[PDB]
Design an enzyme around this catalytic site. Structure first.
Site, PDB file in Angstrom:
ATOM      1  N   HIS A  61      26.368  31.950 -60.645  1.00 42.58           N
ATOM      2  CA  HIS A  61      26.758  33.083 -59.702  1.00 42.58           C
ATOM      3  C   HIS A  61      25.533  33.562 -58.871  1.00 42.58           C
ATOM      4  CE1 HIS A  61      26.092  35.190 -63.615  1.00 42.58           C
ATOM      5  NE2 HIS A  61      25.297  35.874 -62.878  1.00 42.58           N
ATOM      6  N   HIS A  91      17.020  38.438 -58.678  1.00 40.05           N
ATOM      7  CA  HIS A  91      18.067  37.578 -58.110  1.00 40.05           C
ATOM      8  C   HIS A  91      18.520  38.227 -56.779  1.00 40.05           C
ATOM      9  CE1 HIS A  91      20.384  40.621 -60.336  1.00 40.05           C
ATOM     10  NE2 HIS A  91      21.209  40.490 -59.280  1.00 40.05           N
ATOM     11  N   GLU A 103      25.261  44.226 -51.181  1.00 40.34           N
ATOM     12  CA  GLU A 103      26.260  44.887 -52.031  1.00 40.34           C
ATOM     13  C   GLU A 103      26.390  46.346 -51.620  1.00 40.34           C
ATOM     14  OE1 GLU A 103      25.424  43.663 -56.416  1.00 40.34           O
ATOM     15  OE2 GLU A 103      27.003  42.318 -55.774  1.00 40.34           O
ATOM     16  N   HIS A 116      17.707  42.102 -55.975  1.00 38.62           N
ATOM     17  CA  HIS A 116      17.742  43.071 -57.107  1.00 38.62           C
ATOM     18  C   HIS A 116      16.670  42.602 -58.140  1.00 38.62           C
ATOM     19  CE1 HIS A 116      22.281  44.045 -56.311  1.00 38.62           C
ATOM     20  NE2 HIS A 116      21.523  44.793 -55.575  1.00 38.62           N
TER      21      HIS A 116
HETATM   22 ZN   LIG Z   1      22.501  41.872 -58.432  1.00 39.05          ZN
END
Ligand SMILES: [Zn+2]
Length: 256
Positions: A61, A91, A103, A116
């Site tokens: 992911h 990541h 996000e 992040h």
């Molecule tokens: Zn993240």
């Protein structure tokens, strides 16, 4: 299994992770007129001179750059934090197009990607105990806009070739995260959770106001990654971002 497609997308996560509809979910939309300037808020303290990267892994992911967190080598303190948070991994989240990928959004503005840098409270002893507490984690969120290249990012760009599919890892030593920080450390902070399952509400989010710019070619390589494992039908690792969640009366505070 959870992922980001129409059949296992963020919209289905609540089934397996009810907390998905909890009261302190992330990410969120940061409304700049509504955030509150809080003068009691201290400057962040980012001490990464001693960070020890170990490897990079494609976990299906995203890709995680992991660090040695067995000692207080890379820590974050100050800001709205109490105690010491050790850096465990960093990541990204990115899109299929430059118009989306982040996000968190600012005034509903979506950036190209979002970095992040994940940290855990050391009074809990290990990352695994930390996620079980309200103030267990501290995540630094940094927005990426497409412009000029980010020199400090190229080392990462270059090894992606190596960990194309899920489960692959590569030695990734001597990478200094200081090269991914913006000039300014002005921030917004709110209490939230992990943005991926298990979506535990253990995070104090520290989202930097100032974005880092990366070039079009930098971003392009992120998109060459695969969600799938090797020898499986190819599915480009794009749009691995969860949409904004209800703020639900939480207050967003600003350091500026
Ligand atoms: Zn993240």
């Amino acid at each position: 299994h959870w992922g980001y497609g129409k059949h296992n997308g963020p919209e289905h996560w609540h089934k397996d992770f009810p907390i998905a509809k909890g009261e302190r979910q992330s990410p969120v939309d940061i409304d700049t007129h509504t955030a509150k300037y809080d003068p009691s808020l201290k400057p962040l303290s980012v001490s990464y001179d001693q960070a020890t990267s170990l490897r990079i892994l494609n976990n299906g992911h995203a890709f995680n750059v992991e660090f040695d967190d067995s000692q207080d080598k890379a820590v974050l303190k100050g800001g709205p934090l109490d105690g010491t948070y050790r850096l465990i991994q960093f990541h990204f989240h990115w899109g299929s197009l430059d118009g989306q990928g982040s996000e968190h959004t600012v005034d509903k503005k979506k950036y190209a990607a979002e970095l992040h840098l994940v940290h855990w409270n050391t009074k809990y002893g290990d990352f695994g105990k930390a996620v079980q507490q309200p103030d267990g984690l501290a995540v630094l969120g940094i927005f990426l806009k497409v412009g000029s290249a980010k020199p400090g990012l190229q080392k990462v760009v270059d090894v992606l070739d190596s960990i194309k599919t899920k489960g692959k890892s590569a030695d990734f030593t001597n990478f200094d995260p200081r090269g991914l920080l913006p000039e300014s450390l002005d921030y917004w902070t709110y209490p939230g959770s992990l943005t991926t399952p298990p979506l535990l509400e253990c995070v104090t989010w520290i989202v930097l106001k100032e974005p880092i710019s990366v070039s079009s070619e930098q971003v392009l390589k992120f998109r060459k990654l695969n969600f799938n494992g090797e020898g499986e039908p190819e599915e480009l690792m794009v749009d691995n971002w969860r949409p904004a969640q209800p703020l639900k009366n939480r207050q967003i505070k600003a350091s500026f």
